[PDB]
RNA sequence: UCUCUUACUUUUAACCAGUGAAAUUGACCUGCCCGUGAAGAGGCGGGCAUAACACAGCAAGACGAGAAGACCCUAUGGAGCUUUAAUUUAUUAAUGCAAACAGAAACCUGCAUUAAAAAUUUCGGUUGGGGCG
RNA sequence: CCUCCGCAUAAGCCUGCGUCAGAUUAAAACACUGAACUGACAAUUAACAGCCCAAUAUCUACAAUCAACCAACAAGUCAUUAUUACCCUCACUGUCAACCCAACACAGGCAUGCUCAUAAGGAAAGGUUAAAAAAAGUAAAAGGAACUCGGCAAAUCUUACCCC
RNA sequence: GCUAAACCUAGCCCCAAACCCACUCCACCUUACUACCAGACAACCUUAGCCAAACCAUUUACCCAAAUAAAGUAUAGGCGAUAGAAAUUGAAACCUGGCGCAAUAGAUAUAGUACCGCAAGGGAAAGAUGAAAAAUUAUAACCAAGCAUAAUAUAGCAAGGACUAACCCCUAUACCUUCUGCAUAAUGAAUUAACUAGAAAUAACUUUGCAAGGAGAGCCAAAGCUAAGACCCCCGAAACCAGACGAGCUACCUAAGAACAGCUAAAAGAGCACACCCGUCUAUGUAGCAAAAUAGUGGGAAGAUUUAUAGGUAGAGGCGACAAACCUA
C-alpha cells in the first residue's frame, strides 16, 4: 500500500468522533434522565448461578405474556451452589499463583542485582 | 550421554548473611527468660505443625480438625482419601504384628 | 495489530520487521533476559543525547545516541562499539562491509556535563517554573533533553498543507454553543427533515 | 448501521432514520468477466442490498437499478503451529448495476510509468552498494585464484 | 505421526533495514574517490628522473 | 491453598455485605438464632444426669434431636411441628435381623378453622398435634401468635402471624368495620401480642423474600442531575447575594 | 466426525436450517400467506446525509496545530455553560420558581419525545 | 473329481529402477551320529565331518511365531440363572384393628397378619476313572 | 480398451487438482511447468430452494388403482363458509470442488430423478524375463465318479424316493 | 563422522497473609452466541457399595466448628472385627518463607489446545546460540545404542589359561525367577537412555541427662524417667455401588413419504427374472481392499417387502417372529 498510516489516521478520527458525539450524548442523558446507561439492564443470576449484566429488549407484549421469555430461566438451583465454590477455588488457585511467582522473580532477581536493595 | 559436557556454573555460599548469622538466637529463651516464653512457640510454618510432630497419618488426621474447614473442596476430597488409605496400610498391612 | 508472545525477547531490529520474524518465529521459546527494573520517570537517556562509553573495546569515547530500547535498557551510539558485517551478499558477490553498532546497557554508558565532557552521574529534580529537569550530582547544571526528529519524520517548520488538509484557522474556530439537544434532533431542524409521527411506547425486558 | 439496536417499529410509528452509518464499503476488481454495468462490492454482514442502494444513492448519488449480493465463506484450513485452525473472515460480495446505462470499469491504480520515478533518486545506502560492485571485477581465471590486491 | 520438519525460512532482502526507522546506518568510508585520478602516462621513466 | 472464612460461616458473611446488611436490625437477629423446637417424635430425658444401672455412676445424660424430613407440601397447612421420619428400622426388632429402610408419616386431617383477628375461615391441612396446641393455647389466634417460628414448621403459620400482628399494631378498622365495640373487644384480648408496625412487618418472611422487600423500598428512578445542579447553583447564589 | 468447535452459520444444515439461520442483517418486514414478503418503508433505516457543498472541514488536520490538552464532556461542564446563565439571569431579576423548570429546558419526562434519551429509540 | 496328469494365457513370481512395512529377536563364532540329562540336545560325554561366501527353492528341527489359547484343577476369587438354600417384607396388593368421620361409608395414617414381586449372601473339606458313596 | 457407469437433487462435508508464487518438494512410484504441499489472490449473484398464514365460530358419510367397466378389503394419501380485521410489497439464507460415513486418495456403506448404453465417465500393463510353488481361466486322447466323509468344485441343465 | 548428545529457564509445589472475579459496543435457554407477539412450565425427598470381620447376613473409622490433657478411659459391639465420648483442663499466633521441583521433574498444561469418542468423558507431545542476528565469516574438540570409517576363513554360551603370534592347543552345560531338582526344548528380557518398589517406635536394646525421683501442667515410678538413634514395599484383576451420558449402528414402535423393469398368469404373503434386499455353497483373503471383504454360485424380489427423514422406549432397564439376540466395531 501507498501510504498505509493514511488508514490508521482515518480509523482514529473516525473513533474520536464517534466518542465526541456519544461523550455530548451521554453527559446530556444524565442531566435529563440522570441513567448512566443508555440501554436498560438489570443484575439477573443465570441458570449457572454467576452474577450477569442482562441487557433489555424490545418487546411488543408484556413479560408475563411472553412464550419465549419465560423459558429461560433466571435463578440458581440448589446443586449449582457446589460448582460456585469449585470454580471459585479455581481462580483461588490461579491468584494465588500469580501472586507467588511475582515474589520469586524478585528474590532472584535481587541476586544478579544486589545494587536494587542497596 | 545423561551427563553434562560443561562444568555447572560456581555457587557461592554467603556464610555470613543476615539468616545464618542469627540462626538457633532465643533457642534458649525459656531457660533465660524466666520461661515466659517457650522455644516451640518460636516455630513459623503451618498452624496444625508448630510444635507437634507425628507420622504422616497424625499429620494428615491433625489437618483434618483443625483447618479442614478452610480447604477447598479438592484438598479437602484428597485429604480424606489419604486418610483412608492410611489407615488401612497402618492397621492392616505390615511384616510385624 | 501487535502479537507478541508473554517471553518475548526484544533485539535491533524492531518488531513486526521481516527480519525480526524470522529471527523470532512465534512458535520458538527462549530464555527471558533478565533486565533491571528502572521506572520511566527514572530514566535519563534519551536520543540525541551524547553519552560516553564506560565499558567496551573503545571506552572513554563520546557519541550521539540514536536508539534506545527500554524493555531491555538498550543504548545505541553511532560510530562506536560497531562490529562490521557483509550487507547486500549475494551468490556471487562477496558482500560490502558496512560497520554495525552494538547496543549498551545503561550502567556502561554515563552522560557528560554539557560544560565539562567528563563522566558525571545525574539527578532528576525540578526548576522555579516547576518543570522536571535533570541535575548532575556533581557541579549541578541544566542538561535539557535534545531535540530529536519525530519517528514518523514530519518536519512542522517545513510542512505544506495538502488538498485535503484542514487548515488551521479551520481546525481551531469553535463553532459548538452547548445546549439541551441531541445530535439527532439538532440535525433535524437544520436539514429540515419534519416527522410528525410519534413514537409509541414499548415494553423493555 | 451494525452492533447497534436498532428501535422496534410499530403500526403507524415514525420512519427510522440513521444520522451516523459505520457501514463502510470497498470496491474490487472483480475476479472474472463481468457486464460493463455491473459494479463489485465488498459489503458487512449486517447490510443489504436495500440499504446499500440507498447507501449508494444517499451517500454517491449513484442512481442503481440492480442490487445482487452473496456471502463468500472464509477458508477455515489454514492450521497453526499449534494445529489450530486459522479462520479467514466470511464477507459479502455485492454486485451493483448501474441505473442510466453508465459503463464502470475498475481503473489502473498502479501504473508502470507513474511507478517509474522520472526524477533522479540517489539512496545513500543503495549509491554505496552500487559503485563498488561495478568497480570490483570478477577473478580473472589466468590469475588462478591469486589475490588481486598486491600489485608485485 | 504427524510430525513434519521445521522448514518455514525465506529469503528476504538484506539491501535496506526495515523502513520508517529512526536509526540509520552510520558509514566511515565513503564507496569510491569522488574525483577518479588518472597518472600521466610515462610516470615510470619518471621515477628514475627524480629531479 | 486456604480460604480466608470457614466454608459454614460463608453463609453469615453474604450478610455482611449487600443487600442483605441493609436489612433490619430485628430481623437480621431472628434469622441468626438457632432456638431448639419443642420434642415432638422423642421423649426428653427430663434431667442432665442420670444414674447409670449398670456401674451405679451418675453420669451425663443429653437430648439429642431425630431429624425431621417436611414435605413442600407441609408448607400450605399445620401439621404443628411434625413431619416424615426418615429412619432405619430391625426386622422384628431384633439387632441380628437385617436393616430395612422405614418412613413415618403424620396423618393429616383437612380441618376448617375460623380467625377472630381476620374474621375468616381457613380449610387447612392439620394433624392431631395442631388440633391438641390449638385446645391448649385456647384459639387458634392465641396458637399462631404464641408458637414460636421452629415449632410451627409452617411457611403459611408464619404469614398468619404477620398477618395476624399487623392487624394488631395498625388497628385496622377492616375488622367488623359495622361493629366498632366488637373491634376493640378483639383486640383488648390479643393485647400482649402487640408488635410496632416497623418489626412487625418483616415476621416470618424468608431470606430471599426479605432480600426483594428490601429491594423494592431502595428501587426509585434516579434523580436528574438537572435537579440536583439546580438546588447547587441557586444555594451559591444566595451565598453570593449576601456576600454584596 | 463433525467439528463442534466451528462457528455455526447458515451455510451449515439442511435446507430447513439454512434458511432460517441468518447474518444478523435486521429484518425489514414479515411473511405473509403464500411466502409473499411485505416490506415495510419505516423499518427500512433511511440515511440522513447532508451536503458537503462549501465544507470548510477536512479529513486530515495540518501538523501545525496545538497540543491542546484533553478536556473530555460531563454533565456538571454542561449544565454550566447552558442552562446556568439562563438560571442566574432570572435569579438576579428575581422571577424564579421551580415550577418553570420546563421553561429553562428541563424535560421532566421523555414520553412525547422523538428522541427519546432512556430508553433511546434512535439509531447511531 | 479320478485312473494320470498335461498344454497355454493372465496374476503372482524372479531380475532392473522408485517408494518402503509387520509379527519376531537373552547372547550366538548357530553341524551329523551315538550316549547322557528336569525323562525329546546346534551348546554336556565319546566319535565323525568341516576354507569363506551370496542368490533361488524346500518345510524335518529350532518342543517355530501369534491372544498368560483350548482342555482338567485350585481360590473361604466373581457373575448369570433356577429353587421346597439361608435371611427379610422395607416396597406392592388384599384384609383386620386403632385412628379419623358421618351416622353409614370412603380417602389418609399407624400397627399387624397373608401373599405377590424382589433383595442380600453362600455353594465345608477327605477319598473314589465305569458311580448311585 | 473398459464402461454394473454417468449427470443432478437430497443428506453430509466446509474451499479440499481455479490462478500466481514458493528456501518449495513426498502424494504409500514420479515430478522441472514441480503439485491432491505452503503462501497469496480469486470465487458460488435468484426466478430454483428455504424462511409463510388476523381472529372467532362453523363446515368436511361416498378411496386409490388411466377410474370408465368390473371386483374387493386391509377401508384408505389431499375440500370450507359466515362476520370482523385488512390494502405496505420482492427482504433474508443456501448456490464451489475430484466432496460424504469407514483411523487412509480404503475393491466397503450410500436415498430419490433421469440415461438402460451412453451424447457421459474412465485406464487392468513401471520395464524385463517367461523357473518352481500359488491364484484365475481355457483346452484334452481312451475311460466317465473308479476321486471323495459327501457328485465338493466343474461340466451338464436330469429322473425317482425317504426323514423333518 | 553421521544420527545424536549436552546446555536453564519457563513455570510449578507446599505454607503464610488476605475473604475473590464477573456492563466497551453487539449477540447468546429457539438448532445458545439467532433485533421484533397471548404465556402459564417448576427447585426441596435417609446415600449406597467396595472394603475389614481372613466367607458372610448385625456391624466396620470418614473435618462439623479449641490445640493439648482427661483417653484410647467410661461406654458400644455376631461383647468380635472394631467403634468411642463427656464433665473438666486451656493457645500461642511476627505474610513476603523452602536441608520444594528444574522440561520423562514440578500443576494435565506451551493446553483442557491438538487429537480420540455420537455423547458424558479421556487427553497429549515439546523449548534451549550470543552483549549484539541491524555479528549466521554461526552455538570448536571429545561422550548411549545404531551405523560408517573397516564383510568374511575349520571348532562350537564365544571366554579363560596362555603364547613369539588374532585364531589354532587346553578348560568351561548363559542370566533371572519359580520348584526337591532347570544347559534345559519352563517363565521374562532386541537394545540404549531416563523413570520405577520397606512408610509406623508399644516393648526391648544401645548411647546421654537427672535420680527415689524423672518430665517445660496431664504421665510414669518397688531404679526409674526424659530425649535421640534404630523394624514393617511395588504393579495387576474379573467385580460392587452411586450419579451422569448414549436408540446418527442395531432391536421394536410412531409420524408423514418413496421404490418395485419385463414376461407368465391371475384380482395369489403366485411363478420366471432386473433394480433392490439377503448371504446357501465354494475359492481367494487371514496385520487382507475390508477390526467380516472379493469372485462365482445362490434366497426373496406387490410384500410378514425394501428404504430415506424426524421422534420414542436407557442398564435394578430397553427391546426381542427366544438367537441368552440386540442396545455405537
Ligand atoms: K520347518
Ligand atoms: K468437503
Ligand atoms: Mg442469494
Ligand atoms: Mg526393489
Ligand atoms: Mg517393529
Ligand atoms: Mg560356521
Ligand atoms: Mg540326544
Ligand atoms: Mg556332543
Ligand atoms: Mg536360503
Ligand atoms: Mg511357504
Ligand atoms: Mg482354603
Ligand atoms: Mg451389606
Ligand atoms: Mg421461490
Ligand atoms: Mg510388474
Ligand atoms: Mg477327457
Ligand atoms: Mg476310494
Ligand atoms: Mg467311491
Ligand atoms: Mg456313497
Ligand atoms: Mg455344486
Ligand atoms: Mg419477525
Ligand atoms: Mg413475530
Ligand atoms: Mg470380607
Ligand atoms: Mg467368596
Ligand atoms: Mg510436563
Ligand atoms: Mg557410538
Ligand atoms: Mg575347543
Ligand atoms: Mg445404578
Ligand atoms: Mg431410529
Ligand atoms: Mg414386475
Ligand atoms: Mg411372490
Ligand atoms: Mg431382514
Ligand atoms: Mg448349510
Ligand atoms: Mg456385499
Ligand atoms: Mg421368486
Ligand atoms: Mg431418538
Ligand atoms: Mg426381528
Ligand atoms: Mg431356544
Ligand atoms: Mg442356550
Given at each position: 500500500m501507498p501510504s498505509p498510516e493514511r488508514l490508521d489516521k482515518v480509523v482514529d478520527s473516525m473513533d474520536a468522533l464517534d466518542k465526541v458525539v456519544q461523550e455530548r450524548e451521554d453527559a446530556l442523558r444524565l442531566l435529563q434522565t440522570g441513567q448512566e446507561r443508555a440501554r436498560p439492564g438489570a443484575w439477573r443470576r443465570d441458570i449457572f448461578g454467576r452474577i450477569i449484566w442482562h441487557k433489555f429488549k424490545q418487546w411488543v407484549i408484556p413479560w408475563h405474556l411472553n412464550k419465549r421469555y419465560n423459558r429461560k430461566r433466571f435463578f440458581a438451583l440448589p446443586y449449582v451452589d457446589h460448582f460456585l465454590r469449585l470454580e471459585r477455588e479455581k481462580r483461588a488457585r490461579i491468584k494465588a499463583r500469580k501472586e507467588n511467582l511475582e515474589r520469586k522473580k524478585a528474590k532472584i532477581l535481587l541476586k544478579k542485582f544486589p545494587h536494587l536493595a542497596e | 550421554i545423561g551427563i553434562r559436557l560443561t562444568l555447572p556454573p560456581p555457587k557461592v555460599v554467603d556464610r555470613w548473611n543476615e539468616k545464618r548469622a542469627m540462626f538457633g538466637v532465643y533457642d534458649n529463651i525459656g531457660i533465660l527468660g524466666n520461661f515466659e516464653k517457650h522455644p516451640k512457640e518460636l516455630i513459623r510454618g503451618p498452624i496444625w505443625l508448630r510444635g507437634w510432630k507425628g507420622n504422616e497419618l497424625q499429620r494428615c488426621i491433625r489437618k483434618r480438625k483443625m483447618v479442614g474447614s478452610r480447604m477447598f473442596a479438592d484438598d479437602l476430597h484428597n485429604l480424606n482419601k489419604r486418610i483412608r488409605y492410611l489407615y488401612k496400610h497402618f492397621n492392616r498391612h505390615g511384616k510385624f504384628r | 495489530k501487535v502479537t507478541l508472545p508473554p517471553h518475548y525477547?526484544?533485539?535491533?531490529?524492531?518488531?513486526?520487521?521481516?527480519?525480526?520474524?524470522?529471527?523470532?518465529?512465534?512458535?520458538?521459546?527462549?530464555?527471558?533476559?533478565?533486565?533491571?527494573?528502572?521506572?520511566?520517570?527514572?530514566?535519563?537517556?534519551?536520543?540525541?543525547?551524547?553519552?560516553?562509553?564506560?565499558?567496551?573495546?573503545?571506552?572513554?569515547?563520546?557519541?550521539?545516541?540514536?536508539?534506545?530500547?527500554?524493555?531491555?535498557?538498550?543504548?545505541?551510539?553511532?560510530?562506536?562499539?560497531?562490529?562490521?558485517?557483509?550487507?547486500?551478499?549475494?551468490?556471487?558477490?562477496?558482500?560490502?562491509?558496512?560497520?554495525?553498532?552494538?547496543?549498551?546497557?545503561?550502567?556502561?554508558?554515563?552522560?557528560?556535563?554539557?560544560?565539562?565532557?567528563?563522566?558525571?552521574?545525574?539527578?532528576?529534580?525540578?526548576?522555579?517554573?516547576?518543570?522536571?529537569?535533570?541535575?548532575?550530582?556533581?557541579?549541578?547544571?541544566?542538561?535539557?533533553?535534545?531535540?530529536?526528529?519525530?519517528?514518523?519524520?514530519?518536519?512542522?517548520?517545513?510542512?505544506?498543507?495538502?488538498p485535503k488538509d484542514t487548515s488551521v484557522e479551520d481546525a481551531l474556530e469553535r463553532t459548538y454553543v452547548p445546549c439541551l439537544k441531541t445530535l439527532q434532533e439538532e440535525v433535524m431542524e437544520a436539514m429540515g427533515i419534519k416527522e410528525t409521527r410519534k413514537y409509541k411506547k414499548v415494553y423493555w425486558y | 448501521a451494525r452492533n447497534v439496536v436498532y428501535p422496534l417499529y410499530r403500526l403507524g410509528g415514525p420512519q427510522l432514520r440513521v444520522f451516523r452509518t459505520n457501514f463502510f464499503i470497498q470496491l474490487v476488481r472483480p475476479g472474472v468477466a463481468q457486464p460493463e454495468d455491473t459494479v463489485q462490492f465488498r459489503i458487512p454482514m449486517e447490510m443489504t442490498r436495500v440499504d446499500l442502494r440507498n447507501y449508494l444513492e444517499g451517500i454517491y448519488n449513484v442512481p442503481v437499478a440492480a442490487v445482487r449480493t452473496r456471502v463468500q465463506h472464509g477458508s477455515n484450513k489454514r492450521r497453526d503451529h499449534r494445529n489450530v485452525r486459522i479462520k479467514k473472515p466470511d464477507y459479502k460480495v455485492a454486485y451493483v448495476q448501474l441505473a442510466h446505462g453508465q459503463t464502470f470499469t475498475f481503473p489502473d491504480l498502479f501504473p508502470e510509468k507513474d511507478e517509474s520515478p522520472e526524477g533522479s533518486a540517489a539512496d545513500d545506502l543503495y549509491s554505496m552498494l552500487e559503485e563498488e560492485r561495478q568497480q570490483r571485477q570478477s577473478s580473472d581465471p589466468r590469475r588462478g585464484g591469486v589475490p588481486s590486491w598486491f600489485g608485485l | 505421526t504427524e510430525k513434519e520438519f521445521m522448514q518455514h525460512a525465506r529469503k528476504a532482502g538484506l539491501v535496506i533495514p526495515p523502513e520508517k526507522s529512526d536509526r540509520s546506518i552510520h558509514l566511515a568510508c565513503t564507496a569510491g574517490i569522488f574525483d577518479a585520478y588518472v597518472p600521466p602516462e610515462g610516470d615510470a621513466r619518471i621515477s628514475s628522473l627524480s629531479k | 491453598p486456604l480460604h480466608k472464612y470457614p466454608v459454614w460461616l460463608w453463609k453469615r458473611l453474604q450478610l455482611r455485605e449487600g443487600i442483605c446488611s441493609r436489612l433490619p436490625?430485628?430481623?437480621?437477629?431472628?434469622?441468626?438464632?438457632?432456638?431448639?423446637?419443642?420434642?415432638?417424635?422423642?421423649?426428653?430425658?427430663?434431667?442432665?444426669?442420670?444414674?447409670?444401672?449398670?456401674?451405679?455412676?451418675?453420669?451425663?445424660?443429653?437430648?439429642?434431636?431425630?431429624?425431621?424430613?417436611?414435605?413442600?407440601?407441609?408448607?400450605?397447612?399445620?401439621?404443628?411441628?411434625?413431619?416424615?421420619?426418615?429412619?432405619?428400622?430391625?426386622?422384628?426388632?431384633?439387632?441380628?435381623?437385617?436393616?430395612?429402610?422405614?418412613?413415618?408419616?403424620?396423618?393429616?386431617?383437612?380441618?376448617?378453622?375460623?380467625?377472630?383477628?381476620?374474621?375468616?375461615?381457613?380449610?387447612?391441612?392439620?394433624?392431631?398435634?395442631?388440633?391438641?396446641?390449638?385446645?391448649?393455647?385456647?384459639?387458634?389466634?392465641?396458637?399462631?401468635?404464641?408458637?414460636?417460628?421452629?415449632?410451627?414448621?409452617?411457611?403459611?403459620?408464619?404469614?398468619?402471624?404477620?398477618?395476624?400482628?399487623?392487624?394488631?399494631?395498625?388497628?385496622?378498622?377492616?375488622?367488623?368495620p359495622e361493629d366498632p365495640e366488637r373491634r376493640a373487644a378483639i383486640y383488648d384480648k390479643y393485647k400482649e401480642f402487640a408488635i410496632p408496625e416497623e418489626e412487625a412487618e418483616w415476621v416470618g418472611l424468608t431470606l430471599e423474600e426479605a432480600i426483594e422487600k428490601q429491594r423494592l423500598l431502595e428501587e426509585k428512578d434516579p434523580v436528574p442531575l438537572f435537579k440536583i445542579y439546580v438546588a447547587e447553583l441557586i444555594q451559591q447564589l444566595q451565598q453570593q447575594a449576601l456576600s454584596e | 466426525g463433525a467439528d463442534r468447535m466451528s462457528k455455526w452459520t447458515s451455510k451449515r444444515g439442511p435446507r430447513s436450517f439454512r434458511g432460517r439461520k441468518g447474518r444478523g442483517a435486521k429484518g425489514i418486514g414479515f411473511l405473509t400467506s403464500g411466502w409473499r414478503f411485505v416490506q415495510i418503508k419505516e423499518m427500512v433505516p433511511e440515511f440522513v446525509v447532508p451536503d458537503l457543498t462549501g465544507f470548510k472541514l477536512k479529513p486530515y488536520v495540518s501538523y501545525l496545530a496545538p497540543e491542546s490538552e484533553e478536556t473530555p464532556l460531563t454533565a456538571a461542564?454542561?449544565?454550566?455553560?447552558?442552562?446556568?446563565?439562563?438560571?442566574?439571569?432570572?435569579?438576579?431579576?428575581?422571577?424564579?420558581?421551580?415550577?418553570?423548570?420546563?421553561?429553562?429546558?428541563?424535560?421532566?419526562?421523555?414520553?412525547?419525545?422523538?428522541?427519546?434519551?432512556?430508553?433511546?429509540?434512535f439509531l447511531r
Amino acid at each position: 500500500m501507498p501510504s498505509p498510516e493514511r488508514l490508521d489516521k482515518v480509523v482514529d478520527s473516525m473513533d474520536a468522533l464517534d466518542k465526541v458525539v456519544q461523550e455530548r450524548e451521554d453527559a446530556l442523558r444524565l442531566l435529563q434522565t440522570g441513567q448512566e446507561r443508555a440501554r436498560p439492564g438489570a443484575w439477573r443470576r443465570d441458570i449457572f448461578g454467576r452474577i450477569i449484566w442482562h441487557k433489555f429488549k424490545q418487546w411488543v407484549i408484556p413479560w408475563h405474556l411472553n412464550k419465549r421469555y419465560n423459558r429461560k430461566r433466571f435463578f440458581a438451583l440448589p446443586y449449582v451452589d457446589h460448582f460456585l465454590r469449585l470454580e471459585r477455588e479455581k481462580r483461588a488457585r490461579i491468584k494465588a499463583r500469580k501472586e507467588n511467582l511475582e515474589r520469586k522473580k524478585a528474590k532472584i532477581l535481587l541476586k544478579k542485582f544486589p545494587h536494587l536493595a542497596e | 550421554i545423561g551427563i553434562r559436557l560443561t562444568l555447572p556454573p560456581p555457587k557461592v555460599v554467603d556464610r555470613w548473611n543476615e539468616k545464618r548469622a542469627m540462626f538457633g538466637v532465643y533457642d534458649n529463651i525459656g531457660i533465660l527468660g524466666n520461661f515466659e516464653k517457650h522455644p516451640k512457640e518460636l516455630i513459623r510454618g503451618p498452624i496444625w505443625l508448630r510444635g507437634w510432630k507425628g507420622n504422616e497419618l497424625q499429620r494428615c488426621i491433625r489437618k483434618r480438625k483443625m483447618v479442614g474447614s478452610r480447604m477447598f473442596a479438592d484438598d479437602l476430597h484428597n485429604l480424606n482419601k489419604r486418610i483412608r488409605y492410611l489407615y488401612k496400610h497402618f492397621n492392616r498391612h505390615g511384616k510385624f504384628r | 495489530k501487535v502479537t507478541l508472545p508473554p517471553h518475548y525477547r526484544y533485539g535491533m531490529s524492531p518488531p513486526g520487521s521481516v527480519a525480526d520474524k524470522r529471527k523470532n518465529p512465534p512458535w520458538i521459546r527462549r530464555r527471558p533476559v533478565v533486565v533491571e527494573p528502572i521506572s520511566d520517570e527514572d530514566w535519563y537517556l534519551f536520543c540525541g543525547d551524547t553519552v560516553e562509553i564506560l565499558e567496551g573495546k573503545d571506552a572513554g569515547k563520546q557519541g550521539k545516541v540514536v536508539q534506545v530500547i527500554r524493555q531491555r535498557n538498550w543504548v545505541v551510539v553511532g560510530g562506536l562499539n560497531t562490529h562490521y558485517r557483509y550487507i547486500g551478499k549475494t551468490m556471487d558477490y562477496r558482500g560490502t562491509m558496512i560497520p554495525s553498532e552494538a547496543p549498551l546497557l545503561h550502567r556502561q554508558v554515563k552522560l557528560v556535563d554539557p560544560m565539562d565532557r567528563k563522566p558525571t552521574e545525574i539527578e532528576w529534580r525540578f526548576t522555579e517554573a516547576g518543570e522536571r529537569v535533570r541535575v548532575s550530582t556533581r557541579s549541578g547544571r541544566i542538561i535539557p533533553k535534545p531535540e530529536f526528529p519525530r519517528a514518523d519524520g514530519i518536519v512542522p517548520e517545513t510542512w505544506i498543507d495538502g488538498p485535503k488538509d484542514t487548515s488551521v484557522e479551520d481546525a481551531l474556530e469553535r463553532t459548538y454553543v452547548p445546549c439541551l439537544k441531541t445530535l439527532q434532533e439538532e440535525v433535524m431542524e437544520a436539514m429540515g427533515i419534519k416527522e410528525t409521527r410519534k413514537y409509541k411506547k414499548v415494553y423493555w425486558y | 448501521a451494525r452492533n447497534v439496536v436498532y428501535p422496534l417499529y410499530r403500526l403507524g410509528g415514525p420512519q427510522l432514520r440513521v444520522f451516523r452509518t459505520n457501514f463502510f464499503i470497498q470496491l474490487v476488481r472483480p475476479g472474472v468477466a463481468q457486464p460493463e454495468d455491473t459494479v463489485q462490492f465488498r459489503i458487512p454482514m449486517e447490510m443489504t442490498r436495500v440499504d446499500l442502494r440507498n447507501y449508494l444513492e444517499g451517500i454517491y448519488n449513484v442512481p442503481v437499478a440492480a442490487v445482487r449480493t452473496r456471502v463468500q465463506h472464509g477458508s477455515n484450513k489454514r492450521r497453526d503451529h499449534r494445529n489450530v485452525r486459522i479462520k479467514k473472515p466470511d464477507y459479502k460480495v455485492a454486485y451493483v448495476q448501474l441505473a442510466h446505462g453508465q459503463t464502470f470499469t475498475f481503473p489502473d491504480l498502479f501504473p508502470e510509468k507513474d511507478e517509474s520515478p522520472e526524477g533522479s533518486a540517489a539512496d545513500d545506502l543503495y549509491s554505496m552498494l552500487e559503485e563498488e560492485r561495478q568497480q570490483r571485477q570478477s577473478s580473472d581465471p589466468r590469475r588462478g585464484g591469486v589475490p588481486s590486491w598486491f600489485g608485485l | 505421526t504427524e510430525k513434519e520438519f521445521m522448514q518455514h525460512a525465506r529469503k528476504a532482502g538484506l539491501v535496506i533495514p526495515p523502513e520508517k526507522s529512526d536509526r540509520s546506518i552510520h558509514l566511515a568510508c565513503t564507496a569510491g574517490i569522488f574525483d577518479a585520478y588518472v597518472p600521466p602516462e610515462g610516470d615510470a621513466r619518471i621515477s628514475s628522473l627524480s629531479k | 491453598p486456604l480460604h480466608k472464612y470457614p466454608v459454614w460461616l460463608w453463609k453469615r458473611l453474604q450478610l455482611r455485605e449487600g443487600i442483605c446488611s441493609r436489612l433490619p436490625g430485628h430481623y437480621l437477629r431472628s434469622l441468626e438464632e438457632e432456638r431448639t423446637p419443642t420434642p415432638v417424635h422423642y421423649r426428653p430425658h427430663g434431667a442432665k444426669f442420670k444414674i447409670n444401672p449398670k456401674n451405679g455412676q451418675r453420669e451425663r445424660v443429653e437430648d439429642v434431636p431425630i431429624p425431621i424430613y417436611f414435605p413442600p407440601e407441609s408448607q400450605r397447612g399445620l401439621w404443628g411441628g411434625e413431619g416424615w421420619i426418615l429412619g432405619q428400622i430391625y426386622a422384628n426388632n431384633d439387632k441380628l435381623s437385617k436393616r430395612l429402610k422405614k418412613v413415618w408419616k403424620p396423618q393429616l386431617f383437612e380441618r376448617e378453622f375460623y380467625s377472630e383477628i381476620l374474621d375468616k375461615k381457613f380449610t387447612v391441612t392439620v394433624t392431631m398435634r395442631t388440633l391438641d396446641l390449638i385446645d391448649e393455647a385456647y384459639g387458634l389466634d392465641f396458637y399462631i401468635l404464641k408458637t414460636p417460628k421452629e415449632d410451627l414448621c409452617s411457611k403459611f403459620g408464619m404469614d398468619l402471624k404477620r398477618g395476624m400482628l399487623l392487624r394488631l399494631a395498625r388497628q385496622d378498622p377492616q375488622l367488623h368495620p359495622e361493629d366498632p365495640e366488637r373491634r376493640a373487644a378483639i383486640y383488648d384480648k390479643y393485647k400482649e401480642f402487640a408488635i410496632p408496625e416497623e418489626e412487625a412487618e418483616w415476621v416470618g418472611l424468608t431470606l430471599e423474600e426479605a432480600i426483594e422487600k428490601q429491594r423494592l423500598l431502595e428501587e426509585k428512578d434516579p434523580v436528574p442531575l438537572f435537579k440536583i445542579y439546580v438546588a447547587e447553583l441557586i444555594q451559591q447564589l444566595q451565598q453570593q447575594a449576601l456576600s454584596e | 466426525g463433525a467439528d463442534r468447535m466451528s462457528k455455526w452459520t447458515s451455510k451449515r444444515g439442511p435446507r430447513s436450517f439454512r434458511g432460517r439461520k441468518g447474518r444478523g442483517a435486521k429484518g425489514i418486514g414479515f411473511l405473509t400467506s403464500g411466502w409473499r414478503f411485505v416490506q415495510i418503508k419505516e423499518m427500512v433505516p433511511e440515511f440522513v446525509v447532508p451536503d458537503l457543498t462549501g465544507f470548510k472541514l477536512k479529513p486530515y488536520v495540518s501538523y501545525l496545530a496545538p497540543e491542546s490538552e484533553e478536556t473530555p464532556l460531563t454533565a456538571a461542564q454542561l449544565f454550566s455553560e447552558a442552562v446556568a446563565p439562563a438560571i442566574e439571569k432570572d435569579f438576579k431579576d428575581g422571577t424564579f420558581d421551580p415550577d418553570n423548570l420546563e421553561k429553562y429546558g428541563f424535560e421532566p419526562t421523555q414520553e412525547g419525545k422523538l428522541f427519546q434519551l432512556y430508553p433511546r429509540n434512535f439509531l447511531r
